[PDB]
Amino acid sequence: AVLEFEASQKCDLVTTGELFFRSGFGIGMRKDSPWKQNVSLSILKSHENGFMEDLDKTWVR
Amino acid sequence: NDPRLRNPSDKFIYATVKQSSVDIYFRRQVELSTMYRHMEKHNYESAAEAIQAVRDNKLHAFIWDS
Amino acid sequence: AVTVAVVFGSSGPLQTQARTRLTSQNFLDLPLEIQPLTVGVNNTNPSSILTQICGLLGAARVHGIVFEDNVDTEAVAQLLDFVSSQTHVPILSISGGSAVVLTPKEPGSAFLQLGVSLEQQLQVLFKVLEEYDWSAFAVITSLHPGHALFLEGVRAVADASYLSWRLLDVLTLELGPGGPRARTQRLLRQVDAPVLVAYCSREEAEVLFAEAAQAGLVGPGHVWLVPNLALGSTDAPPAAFPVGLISVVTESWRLSLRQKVRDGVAILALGAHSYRRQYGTLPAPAGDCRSHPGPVSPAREAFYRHLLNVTWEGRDFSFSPGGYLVRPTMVVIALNRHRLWEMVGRWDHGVLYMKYPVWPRYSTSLQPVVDSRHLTVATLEERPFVIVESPDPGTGGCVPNTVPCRRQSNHTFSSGDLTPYTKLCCKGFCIDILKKLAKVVKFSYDLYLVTNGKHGKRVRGVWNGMIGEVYYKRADMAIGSLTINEERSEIIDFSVPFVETGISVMVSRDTVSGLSDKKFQRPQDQYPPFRFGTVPNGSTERNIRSNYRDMHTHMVKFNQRSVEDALTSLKMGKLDAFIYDAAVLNYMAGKDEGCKLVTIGSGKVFATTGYGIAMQKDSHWKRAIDLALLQLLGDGETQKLETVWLSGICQN
Ligand SMILES: *[C@@H]1O[C@H](CO)[C@@H](O[C@@H]2O[C@H](CO)[C@@H](O)[C@H](O)[C@H]2NC(C)=O)[C@H](O)[C@H]1NC(C)=O
Ligand SMILES: *[C@@H]1O[C@H](CO)[C@@H](O[C@@H]2O[C@H](CO)[C@@H](O)[C@H](O)[C@H]2NC(C)=O)[C@H](O)[C@H]1NC(C)=O
Ligand SMILES: *[C@@H]1O[C@H](CO)[C@@H](O)[C@H](O)[C@H]1NC(C)=O
Ligand SMILES: *[C@@H]1O[C@H](CO)[C@@H](O)[C@H](O)[C@H]1NC(C)=O
Ligand SMILES: *[C@@H]1O[C@H](CO)[C@@H](O)[C@H](O)[C@H]1NC(C)=O
Ligand SMILES: N[C@@H](CCC(=O)O)C(=O)O
């Protein structure tokens, strides 16, 4: 996510090979935090309507 | 490891000689079990007739000693 | 002049049993005019048996004899074989203790017991162990004669199998009345195997089971298996026998005495009829014990050979050269909570069908116990991930690296008592993940498919499909092509995604270039209406409905089904765009002969989510399974599964 953006913006650099450890970015909280579900639900909602697409387009071209 | 071999179809046919070292090799392997099941239904009696079938286009690929 | 004698030896109402019919009009359906003769041995002592049989032979000159007695009998089978060797008359023992197989039988003797040997019972019991994946068993054995043959058969069957059986230990006991009781008790408290196999007579079985109950080997953490010998009168089992005992018997189980007599007379009559058809005449009647016909009398040998292989009413009655029933259909019976011998499974031909997909276990108080580590997993067929097949007919079971699965038992497919469930075998990506989870988290599981709706959609406030099964506690967890979304994550819990996916567009070979394109958002913008649709009752349909009202209202016209059919409609030209899941659309593009393409090079996955393992809300397994999935992702096993299951031809 960061390397591709750097290669696109600053150019003069290339990314090689295919992704070898597929994972995700997540909001971290203390163990058994009571409002985990809230956040998770919100994140899922942000994936559904349009929010993550807008955030991708606006920031990481 | 080709996906045409590891994902068999009725259309594609590859086989080897019956009761040979290759038959044992595919029997032993667990991750090659689907390949063995596909191969066993079309296995050939001898290598020479397998070569003739390959030239005939009845059999697409033949697995045998180098 | 065919004459068939029936001898009744059962020490119950024998006179009521001999008088039961004592007729000639019976056995009419037979291809012969039977001529029966009841002699009913009064008390079954050696002198009485010998004298009555000799008197019958020297009076009626019968062609064959059918013998019947009680189950407590031990040594009568020897005497009958002795008589058959001395007089060269074909006998046929049915029911009771006279039906236990003697393996060597006086080479020139036609005894023909109607029972099954010890090795075949061992084979059936070992296949029962295979079905529930029970290994590491122990053997209990008394000093009963023939125990060496039992142990050798156990070792041979364990050695000559595809599975890797692991015998733990074999213990020999006395199990005799009024003897050392400290020795048996001490030895029984040292065994810890979860599966125990015993071999002893009825009284010894009762003694052993009483001692085991004292030794705490009867509760739900111990399953016992015994052959026919340990059993007695199946109608009235003793109180010493623990609930959940398993044994294997023939079809003669639960049959009445008159039916058994009819079957024996029918076998003899059909043998004589075959002999008459082959040689044009009936076999010679038997002689008498006051002689010794040394010569083998090849006519009698031919009659015996004809009597060996014979079928009746669609059932195989072939006899091995060792004088016992070869390849008969057998039933596996168990002692249920009501303390009755319920029949559990069957052994038709070389394949095993059993009623219970999972073995029940009851507490010492006859309270149904359920193992906390046994998860019930619901799933559904999805070609890239879940594939169902019928088991291989040749080997009975199916190919390894394929987990057995059952189809929902709402509709009973028992057709009597065969099997109430369709037994298939499931394989693929999701099943591989489930097997890895079972190995890592160390839990056991069954697997059943969902026949009530697709993955899941709320209809009239209720949930169907996998989400319905999990939410209503019918299953512990759901695995398969299940997408994580808010409406499901509110009602149930979800695990960490193990394969990423989303909404993707499939077209036939970049005309659209975007899900939010004006072509889709405005169906009537230009050209006649765009023919794009999706499979209803899924996450994609709900996403489209909740986000783009115009999209959903147009999509109702093209309510596709059977994604393969949608794909072929795209190929023919009835459709130009297909909206579906990215994980399956990439696979469908990969194994395409025309190499259909997703809208953008990487599909520009919309509403990116993942496949998760559904669970009951606020469960316990969630944390452990999440950590196990994260470990699998970390060690690259998921990448290996992607390479081995979701590879494509023209994807590179
Ligand atoms: C997660 O979000 C839900 C909203 O859907 C919260 O549920 C509400 O919580 C407040 C205060 O906690 C209550 O006054 C409301 O009655 C709740 N709504 C319903 C429909 O029950 C929930 O509390 C949030 N989770 C946490 C940990 O705060
Ligand atoms: C039981 O088996 C015997 C032979 O094992 C069968 O008898 C044979 O019948 C065929 C008929 O074509 C003859 O050609 C053979 O010569 C016979 N052999 C002997 C040894 O008799 C007999 O038919 C079988 N029983 C039934 C009911 O079919
Ligand atoms: C056979 O038994 C009956 C009663 O069971 C008896 O009356 C009869 O005398 C017996 N016959 C013998 C022992 O020969
Ligand atoms: C069970 O099967 C019946 C058909 O016999 C059908 O109504 C439906 O699939 C099921 N009914 C339920 C679950 O109420
Ligand atoms: C989708 O749901 C509707 C209404 O419940 C039903 O009529 C239709 O057959 C379903 N489509 C499937 C199961 O493919
Ligand atoms: N994975 C999807 C199935 C395909 C679809 O309907 O989009 C789901 O469980 O909802």
Curated annotation (Swiss-Prot), chain A:
Tissue specificity remark: Detected throughout the brain, in brain cortex, cerebellum, thalamus and olfactory bulb.
UniProt subcellular location: Cell membrane; Postsynaptic cell membrane; Synaptic cell membrane; Postsynaptic density membrane
Posttranslational modification: NMDA is probably regulated by C-terminal phosphorylation of an isoform of NR1 by PKC. Its phosphorylated state is influenced by the formation of the NMDAR-PPP2CB complex and the NMDAR channel activity.
Glycosylation sites: 38
Quaternary structure (record): Heterotetramer; the NMDAR subunits are modular and harbor tiered domains that function in concert to regulate opening and closing of the cation-selective ion channel pore. Forms heterotetrameric channels composed of two GluN1/zeta subunits (GRIN1), and two identical GluN2/epsilon subunits (GRIN2A, GRIN2B, GRIN2C or GRIN2D) or GluN3 subunits (GRIN3A or GRIN3B) (in vitro). Can also form heterotetrameric channels that contain at least two GluN1 subunits and at least two different GluN2 subunits (or a combination of one GluN2 and one GluN3 subunits) (in vitro).
Domain notes: A hydrophobic region that gives rise to the prediction of a transmembrane span does not cross the membrane, but is part of a discontinuously helical region that dips into the membrane and is probably part of the pore and of the selectivity filter. The extracellular N-terminal domain (ATD) is a site of allosteric regulation to modulate overall receptor function.
Function: Component of N-methyl-D-aspartate (NMDA) receptors (NMDARs) that function as heterotetrameric, ligand-gated cation channels with high calcium permeability and voltage-dependent block by Mg(2+). NMDARs participate in synaptic plasticity for learning and memory formation by contributing to the long-term potentiation (LTP). Channel activation requires binding of the neurotransmitter L-glutamate to the GluN2 subunit, glycine or D-serine binding to the GluN1 subunit, plus membrane depolarization to eliminate channel inhibition by Mg(2+).
Record-stated family: Belongs to the glutamate-gated ion channel (TC 1.A.10.1) family. NR1/GRIN1 subfamily.
Protein name stated in the entry: Glutamate receptor ionotropic, NMDA 1
Gene giving rise to this polypeptide: Grin1
Shown part of the complete sequence: 734 to 794 of 938
Swiss-Prot record, chain C:
Membrane association type: Multi-pass membrane protein
Tissue specificity statement from the Swiss-Prot or TrEMBL entry: Detected in cerebellum.
Role description: Component of N-methyl-D-aspartate (NMDA) receptors (NMDARs) that function as heterotetrameric, ligand-gated cation channels with high calcium permeability and voltage-dependent block by Mg(2+). Participates in synaptic plasticity for learning and memory formation by contributing to the slow phase of excitatory postsynaptic current and long-term synaptic potentiation. Channel activation requires binding of the neurotransmitter L-glutamate to the GluN2 subunit, glycine or D-serine binding to the GluN1 subunit, plus membrane depolarization to eliminate channel inhibition by Mg(2+).
Higher taxonomy: Eukaryota, Metazoa, Chordata, Craniata, Vertebrata
Identification of the protein by name: Glutamate receptor ionotropic, NMDA 2C
Gene Ontology cellular component list: endoplasmic reticulum membrane; glutamatergic synapse; NMDA selective glutamate receptor complex; plasma membrane; postsynaptic density membrane; postsynaptic membrane
Membrane topology (Extracellular): 1-509, 510-652
Keyword Thylakoid in record: no
